[PDB]
Amino acid sequence: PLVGVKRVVMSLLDGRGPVRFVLALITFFKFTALAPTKALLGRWKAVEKSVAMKHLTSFKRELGTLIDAVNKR
Amino acid sequence: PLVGVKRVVMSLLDGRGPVRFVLALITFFKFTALAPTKALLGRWKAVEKSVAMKHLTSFKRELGTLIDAVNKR
């Protein structure tokens, strides 16, 4: 059976795991235009607006950092 | 056997698929602080700097729009 991150990601696609990880995997689907699973969308809709804002704005700062690192390769 | 997005994501964790999708899933690992697979890191190291800059800056604009939609719930 699956172990490590592959197990973690499979579980997220079945609706299980931390709220921050749900929100992150939703951003992946937004960037790719792929179809999220029903269980993941279920988790996403139930997240409190204030909780969603906090994690997503933190993702944007981290994406900025990543872009700076790439620019300096 | 796996079908739909689960098959797409499994293949990406084995290093297979479009460069935009590799870059997207790398951002998922950055946001979560989870460990990427060796096969995924291999694809990421091989991406041309200009190609990486283009997709990652487009992700940042899409994340902004997503934050806007959450603010307006």
Author numbering:
A (entry chain A), B (entry chain B): 26 to 98
What does the paper say about this structure?
The JEV capsid protein has a helix-rich structure and forms a stable homodimer similar to other flaviviruses.
Here, we present the JEV capsid protein structure at 1.98 Å resolution. Similarly, electron density for the first 25 residues from the JEV C protein N-terminus is not visible in our crystal structure due to cleavage during protein purification. The purified JEV capsid protein, whose size was reduced to less than 15 kDa, was crystallized, and the solved structure has a visible electron density for residues 26–98. Each monomer of the JEV capsid protein is composed of four helices: α1 (amino acid 29–38), α2 (44–57), α3 (63–70), and the longest α4 (74–96), connected by short loops. Almost half of the amino acids of the JEV capsid, of which 41 are residues from the first subunit and 43 are residues from the second subunit, are involved in creating the hydrophobic dimer interface. The α1-α1’ helices of the JEV, WNV, and ZIKV are found on top of the α2-α2’ helices and protect the hydrophobic surface of α2-α2’, thereby forming a closed conformation.
